[PDB]
């Protein structure tokens, strides 16, 4: 039992549809480069999946280190694709827009060709001013910070499938903590179980 | 040989071309056609200013032209006459921003005189059922000839060494292009002895040889992406960035 | 396979590891077991005298388990607000466990009477319902201890592993197999007073808090993935 | 490690002895800043008596 | 340059150094760090029950910092009269700090209920205003401790350095940068009781005093000159 | 000693401070006041990106503030509260051009996170008959205190180590300023955990101590120039230059 024993387990975190007619700049995910990856399940409170590195980050105050996200691009060898997995350090919410692949390739990026091999584990860098990084969510407390950095995934060259196979392709996005991942300060966890999803309000009337 | 056992990861080995932080892969083996051997640094003969290498920032790869190629393009047809030290800037000033936003090209903004060898990849992402074959050819100083309008054809550029892209196997064309010009430096802005033809080395031109031939139910589109690395560059003659005019559209 | 790695496409240089905070803060955190021994609130109750109880009568009984209780949310503002704490959030990630627990039960100030505390490994756990603190006799051969309120009103405990098992279930238990109810709790701890009927009336609606931690014997089994989680800031504010 | 060995069994008293003025270590709460500190007598301040 | 020396024009013979009081008083004083561990009053409050508080409710919360509080002067005759004490007067002379703090919170006599105390490194400090003691729940995963009033009504603490920083700001903090509020306090200590609503009414307007000191981990950074000072005998006498 | 024989070249030796291509001289010996020792590189703890030195281009000196100082300025009076990693950019965006025109600061345009030690010279060109004495003082994180409005005075900044400029001998104040902040990196643009206080290290403030005292027929003006070298810088977190907002006026 070990933090790095948990952080070396992939957890499936995002289903990305990848169609034929997606253009050569269309966004597939702008998801945050923290372990706290948002996956929403469809109660008056909502429940979420997380990566194991996401939860075991959510039992700590601070985290640092790489984040190896695995892109498993489920296709035949007859499909040919190409897509950037880019990574920009330090984009705020107002800079969450203005994003495309042409402004992405200035930063660090990896172009992949979907061919006879269909899977690659990109290693998200840890690029920040701070040695650690505060938990995104914290306790039930409206102050206490978004991601250090943002991943992006644009379709560099669109899917050109053969006419015997399908127009659409699933892309699964796993999240695993990197080899340099480490967490330090034990604080109040930001996540609770769903054994008892009952909640009681405290209005005063 | 003869035991293909594909799992969840497909079959083939994904080969890298790791560099500074842009890392790009291809599934297929390249077909390089080096035109000339590697050149010398050339800083000893005509620059006493601080001749600074920038291999940590300028040797990143950069997409400069992607384009759709369908079956309607005929036999002997141009696709892109990329002029490579220009097109690295022309894709930037075409793509709605200045030079100071892209970390590959800020030494062109600061320094005035450039030298350096280029690396050029022309990736295709054709389906396997398509039949076709592009060619990529580097030519030196296309705009310094008037008779290239007679030559701009597949039969002329086949005689010189040239890379080939078969759309059958979705081959990739790596293409080393060493710097060879009459003067050993290309300037980056308007310069007191020439202005026209700024930062021009010649034509990377991508001529179709075999057009897309498919069924009636065939995949019509075939996108082609061109990346460029710039590794053994030297920059000299530091000056102000306000002198740098925009490149020509 | 889950933990496979098809093609690494790293851009990074090798990071300096801090040694999990040992370099900065002077202490490691990679071992989660050494975090588990930090105490966490187990379950807080309010005393309620129902009958004119005998001195033998247990005041409350509760099963003893590292899984965290059936969460009892006038709500308790911690269990309404701070959901689950740490140890069932880790214990969600393991199907089984085996080992000791520590308790350190804290008693209020206005009580003075002597306190007896029992471990009962005979008691099974029938379903996830009624796996909480229960406000209800003293027994001989069960493992016992008396803390005196007048010296110090906080007892401490090292409740051992008494099961005839290889390990025990760690997720929330639905009581499917009838003998499997013998294999969830470590047993059953009961807290009872020696207070007479006159003086226990003053102690009504006083809080009795119980903490818990594992204490170096606990060794979790086979990994199981986490359940769906609730994000705590999404909980509503008390509109006034 | 759990320390299960059974502990000591003392007697409290409220005050240290008073008539004892000899080879006997007396614990206090010094308002001096130093734990090893003792009032001292320099070269002229060593008293005669 | 500041500390240069152009031309010495000494008249003096060489003085015998006392070794900073070691020769006379049997103890050195040159190291100011060993003076810093002498305790100083941090902030004294008066208890005030606003609502019929739950047992979970913190009675007061305060940020934890060696800078000295936002000084809260019916004035408190110490903070009206004895301005600032020692440790912020030294801490005026250094822009940054990094290290531990000790607390030793002292509770009044008429209280009897159990006391829980939290460290919360999640809490930032928003401006120099509201950087004082605040009379307002209990939480799980924060570092916790219960002192029992009946054994001894003075808790003691070693609150560590939990920041993701190289060091932290030591002058009075105006909250310019938004993330810099994470880097001033060590965290936030909260003191809350387990007292019910009936017995906490007796404890209203009882003083709760908090002390502080650094405890050997503190290492001050880059020198900064002192601010302007106020001379204390110039303060007026209470004319009767 | 005691044999001054001045020729056409004057008397004194002109001492250099050669660097990359900006070379600047002073006639007088400096008075440095180093506040803190030299710091470590700090690239091992929080950056896995390409941490590239730029000592060929960023270690050039650069004028960031010149100003007129006359005798009408009183005793305890500010002249310039230069915030030094900002004022290197603020003089640029004040001086009618963007960052991409100055070769010192283009890695601030490309990269997002900065670290580095500074060198700061405050040259004066006073006449010898003038009497006066400026002081230069480096302070760490001026804007991260509210009480500096009580401290912003010559008596406060004299207690910390500080350089002095006598207008009598026209002394120069070299001033090494090593990088020391709470977090070991200063960001260069709007960053997801702080925005306000971007690239702020603290105040270089130039307070008058002795004002200009001259005759009735005296030289009233006394210009003061401030140069800055930036040598042990590291830049990390490469991103697009279109993200870089302008600095605050
Ligand atoms: O109250 C007691 C008495 C003895 N002891 C142990 O018994 C041993 C003999 O005690 P004496 O003081 O030599 C020694 O190992 C002690 O530590 C206790 O631990 N507690």
mmCIF file of N, CA, C and O in Angstrom, chain A residues 142-184:
data_model
loop_
_atom_site.group_PDB
_atom_site.id
_atom_site.type_symbol
_atom_site.label_atom_id
_atom_site.label_comp_id
_atom_site.label_asym_id
_atom_site.label_seq_id
_atom_site.Cartn_x
_atom_site.Cartn_y
_atom_site.Cartn_z
ATOM 1 N N UNK A 142 -15.542 27.928 -0.997
ATOM 2 C CA UNK A 142 -15.633 28.444 -2.363
ATOM 3 C C UNK A 142 -14.352 29.103 -2.860
ATOM 4 O O UNK A 142 -14.030 28.938 -4.049
ATOM 5 N N UNK A 143 -13.570 29.836 -2.051
ATOM 6 C CA UNK A 143 -12.190 30.090 -2.465
ATOM 7 C C UNK A 143 -11.342 28.843 -2.279
ATOM 8 O O UNK A 143 -11.833 27.783 -1.895
ATOM 9 N N UNK A 144 -10.047 28.979 -2.583
ATOM 10 C CA UNK A 144 -9.140 27.849 -2.834
ATOM 11 C C UNK A 144 -9.706 26.919 -3.905
ATOM 12 O O UNK A 144 -9.574 25.698 -3.823
ATOM 13 N N UNK A 145 -8.698 27.113 -7.020
ATOM 14 C CA UNK A 145 -7.695 27.379 -8.036
ATOM 15 C C UNK A 145 -7.752 26.332 -9.136
ATOM 16 O O UNK A 145 -7.807 25.133 -8.871
ATOM 17 N N UNK A 146 -7.735 26.796 -10.384
ATOM 18 C CA UNK A 146 -7.808 25.913 -11.540
ATOM 19 C C UNK A 146 -6.477 25.239 -11.854
ATOM 20 O O UNK A 146 -5.564 25.219 -11.023
ATOM 21 N N UNK A 147 -6.385 24.679 -13.050
ATOM 22 C CA UNK A 147 -5.287 23.802 -13.413
ATOM 23 C C UNK A 147 -3.982 24.581 -13.580
ATOM 24 O O UNK A 147 -4.008 25.787 -13.833
ATOM 25 N N UNK A 148 -2.826 23.924 -13.428
ATOM 26 C CA UNK A 148 -1.567 24.611 -13.745
ATOM 27 C C UNK A 148 -1.397 24.818 -15.216
ATOM 28 O O UNK A 148 -0.755 25.776 -15.646
ATOM 29 N N UNK A 149 -1.955 23.919 -15.999
ATOM 30 C CA UNK A 149 -1.612 23.797 -17.399
ATOM 31 C C UNK A 149 -2.754 23.053 -18.057
ATOM 32 O O UNK A 149 -3.602 22.466 -17.384
ATOM 33 N N UNK A 150 -2.793 23.106 -19.375
ATOM 34 C CA UNK A 150 -3.903 22.498 -20.076
ATOM 35 C C UNK A 150 -3.386 21.601 -21.181
ATOM 36 O O UNK A 150 -2.446 21.953 -21.901
ATOM 37 N N UNK A 151 -4.001 20.436 -21.291
ATOM 38 C CA UNK A 151 -3.807 19.550 -22.416
ATOM 39 C C UNK A 151 -4.751 19.953 -23.544
ATOM 40 O O UNK A 151 -5.839 20.479 -23.308
ATOM 41 N N UNK A 152 -4.336 19.703 -24.780
ATOM 42 C CA UNK A 152 -5.268 19.864 -25.886
ATOM 43 C C UNK A 152 -5.096 18.720 -26.861
ATOM 44 O O UNK A 152 -4.033 18.104 -26.947
ATOM 45 N N UNK A 153 -6.159 18.437 -27.599
ATOM 46 C CA UNK A 153 -6.032 17.390 -28.597
ATOM 47 C C UNK A 153 -6.821 17.803 -29.841
ATOM 48 O O UNK A 153 -8.047 17.733 -29.904
ATOM 49 N N UNK A 154 -6.086 18.229 -30.858
ATOM 50 C CA UNK A 154 -6.693 18.609 -32.119
ATOM 51 C C UNK A 154 -6.398 17.580 -33.197
ATOM 52 O O UNK A 154 -5.367 16.907 -33.185
ATOM 53 N N UNK A 155 -7.312 17.485 -34.155
ATOM 54 C CA UNK A 155 -7.178 16.548 -35.260
ATOM 55 C C UNK A 155 -6.321 17.260 -36.297
ATOM 56 O O UNK A 155 -6.778 18.170 -36.978
ATOM 57 N N UNK A 156 -5.061 16.846 -36.421
ATOM 58 C CA UNK A 156 -4.191 17.521 -37.377
ATOM 59 C C UNK A 156 -4.547 17.172 -38.814
ATOM 60 O O UNK A 156 -4.719 18.071 -39.644
ATOM 61 N N UNK A 157 -4.671 15.886 -39.130
ATOM 62 C CA UNK A 157 -5.149 15.438 -40.426
ATOM 63 C C UNK A 157 -6.382 14.592 -40.156
ATOM 64 O O UNK A 157 -6.334 13.687 -39.322
ATOM 65 N N UNK A 158 -7.512 14.855 -40.810
ATOM 66 C CA UNK A 158 -8.746 14.155 -40.460
ATOM 67 C C UNK A 158 -8.711 12.705 -40.885
ATOM 68 O O UNK A 158 -7.868 12.291 -41.683
ATOM 69 N N UNK A 159 -9.637 11.933 -40.326
ATOM 70 C CA UNK A 159 -9.717 10.519 -40.637
ATOM 71 C C UNK A 159 -10.125 10.316 -42.085
ATOM 72 O O UNK A 159 -11.132 10.856 -42.547
ATOM 73 N N UNK A 160 -9.319 9.557 -42.811
ATOM 74 C CA UNK A 160 -9.687 9.145 -44.156
ATOM 75 C C UNK A 160 -9.895 7.636 -44.106
ATOM 76 O O UNK A 160 -8.941 6.872 -44.288
ATOM 77 N N UNK A 161 -11.104 7.163 -43.824
ATOM 78 C CA UNK A 161 -11.313 5.722 -43.715
ATOM 79 C C UNK A 161 -11.540 5.093 -45.076
ATOM 80 O O UNK A 161 -11.803 5.777 -46.065
ATOM 81 N N UNK A 162 -11.435 3.771 -45.115
ATOM 82 C CA UNK A 162 -11.813 3.021 -46.300
ATOM 83 C C UNK A 162 -13.329 2.815 -46.300
ATOM 84 O O UNK A 162 -13.985 2.902 -45.262
ATOM 85 N N UNK A 163 -13.901 2.552 -47.478
ATOM 86 C CA UNK A 163 -15.356 2.498 -47.582
ATOM 87 C C UNK A 163 -15.938 1.179 -47.089
ATOM 88 O O UNK A 163 -17.149 0.967 -47.214
ATOM 89 N N UNK A 164 -15.114 0.290 -46.545
ATOM 90 C CA UNK A 164 -15.585 -0.930 -45.911
ATOM 91 C C UNK A 164 -15.686 -0.818 -44.397
ATOM 92 O O UNK A 164 -16.206 -1.736 -43.757
ATOM 93 N N UNK A 165 -15.201 0.272 -43.806
ATOM 94 C CA UNK A 165 -15.198 0.440 -42.362
ATOM 95 C C UNK A 165 -15.958 1.711 -42.008
ATOM 96 O O UNK A 165 -16.508 2.393 -42.872
ATOM 97 N N UNK A 166 -15.992 2.020 -40.713
ATOM 98 C CA UNK A 166 -16.940 3.006 -40.215
ATOM 99 C C UNK A 166 -16.389 4.419 -40.288
ATOM 100 O O UNK A 166 -15.178 4.639 -40.305
ATOM 101 N N UNK A 167 -17.305 5.385 -40.292
ATOM 102 C CA UNK A 167 -16.914 6.787 -40.342
ATOM 103 C C UNK A 167 -16.460 7.291 -38.983
ATOM 104 O O UNK A 167 -15.652 8.221 -38.905
ATOM 105 N N UNK A 168 -16.967 6.703 -37.910
ATOM 106 C CA UNK A 168 -16.703 7.189 -36.568
ATOM 107 C C UNK A 168 -15.762 6.237 -35.841
ATOM 108 O O UNK A 168 -15.730 5.036 -36.122
ATOM 109 N N UNK A 169 -14.976 6.791 -34.919
ATOM 110 C CA UNK A 169 -13.957 6.051 -34.177
ATOM 111 C C UNK A 169 -13.964 6.516 -32.731
ATOM 112 O O UNK A 169 -13.898 7.719 -32.461
ATOM 113 N N UNK A 170 -14.038 5.567 -31.801
ATOM 114 C CA UNK A 170 -13.904 5.886 -30.391
ATOM 115 C C UNK A 170 -12.452 6.190 -30.059
ATOM 116 O O UNK A 170 -11.541 5.535 -30.565
ATOM 117 N N UNK A 171 -12.231 7.173 -29.200
ATOM 118 C CA UNK A 171 -10.916 7.417 -28.616
ATOM 119 C C UNK A 171 -11.080 7.371 -27.109
ATOM 120 O O UNK A 171 -11.815 8.182 -26.533
ATOM 121 N N UNK A 172 -10.399 6.437 -26.460
ATOM 122 C CA UNK A 172 -10.438 6.409 -25.010
ATOM 123 C C UNK A 172 -9.216 7.075 -24.413
ATOM 124 O O UNK A 172 -8.090 6.919 -24.895
ATOM 125 N N UNK A 173 -9.458 7.828 -23.348
ATOM 126 C CA UNK A 173 -8.452 8.640 -22.691
ATOM 127 C C UNK A 173 -8.344 8.144 -21.263
ATOM 128 O O UNK A 173 -9.262 8.357 -20.457
ATOM 129 N N UNK A 174 -7.235 7.476 -20.960
ATOM 130 C CA UNK A 174 -6.878 7.024 -19.629
ATOM 131 C C UNK A 174 -5.971 8.043 -18.966
ATOM 132 O O UNK A 174 -5.281 8.815 -19.635
ATOM 133 N N UNK A 175 -5.950 8.022 -17.642
ATOM 134 C CA UNK A 175 -5.091 8.898 -16.861
ATOM 135 C C UNK A 175 -4.320 8.063 -15.857
ATOM 136 O O UNK A 175 -4.911 7.300 -15.087
ATOM 137 N N UNK A 176 -3.001 8.198 -15.871
ATOM 138 C CA UNK A 176 -2.174 7.561 -14.866
ATOM 139 C C UNK A 176 -1.169 8.586 -14.391
ATOM 140 O O UNK A 176 -0.675 9.392 -15.180
ATOM 141 N N UNK A 177 -0.888 8.567 -13.092
ATOM 142 C CA UNK A 177 0.154 9.431 -12.576
ATOM 143 C C UNK A 177 1.514 9.022 -13.110
ATOM 144 O O UNK A 177 1.809 7.836 -13.269
ATOM 145 N N UNK A 178 2.341 10.023 -13.404
ATOM 146 C CA UNK A 178 3.635 9.779 -13.994
ATOM 147 C C UNK A 178 4.621 9.176 -13.025
ATOM 148 O O UNK A 178 4.330 8.942 -11.854
ATOM 149 N N UNK A 179 5.823 8.913 -13.537
ATOM 150 C CA UNK A 179 6.834 8.267 -12.715
ATOM 151 C C UNK A 179 7.396 9.215 -11.670
ATOM 152 O O UNK A 179 7.860 8.768 -10.616
ATOM 153 N N UNK A 180 7.359 10.516 -11.933
ATOM 154 C CA UNK A 180 7.827 11.492 -10.965
ATOM 155 C C UNK A 180 6.713 12.040 -10.095
ATOM 156 O O UNK A 180 6.944 13.008 -9.368
ATOM 157 N N UNK A 181 5.520 11.462 -10.168
ATOM 158 C CA UNK A 181 4.394 11.966 -9.400
ATOM 159 C C UNK A 181 4.607 11.706 -7.919
ATOM 160 O O UNK A 181 5.093 10.645 -7.526
ATOM 161 N N UNK A 182 4.230 12.685 -7.103
ATOM 162 C CA UNK A 182 4.355 12.604 -5.657
ATOM 163 C C UNK A 182 3.452 13.656 -5.025
ATOM 164 O O UNK A 182 3.280 14.746 -5.572
ATOM 165 N N UNK A 183 2.855 13.306 -3.879
ATOM 166 C CA UNK A 183 1.976 14.207 -3.141
ATOM 167 C C UNK A 183 2.473 14.342 -1.709
ATOM 168 O O UNK A 183 3.100 13.436 -1.158
ATOM 169 N N UNK A 184 2.217 15.503 -1.105
ATOM 170 C CA UNK A 184 2.790 15.720 0.219
ATOM 171 C C UNK A 184 1.811 15.914 1.371
ATOM 172 O O UNK A 184 1.797 15.110 2.300
#
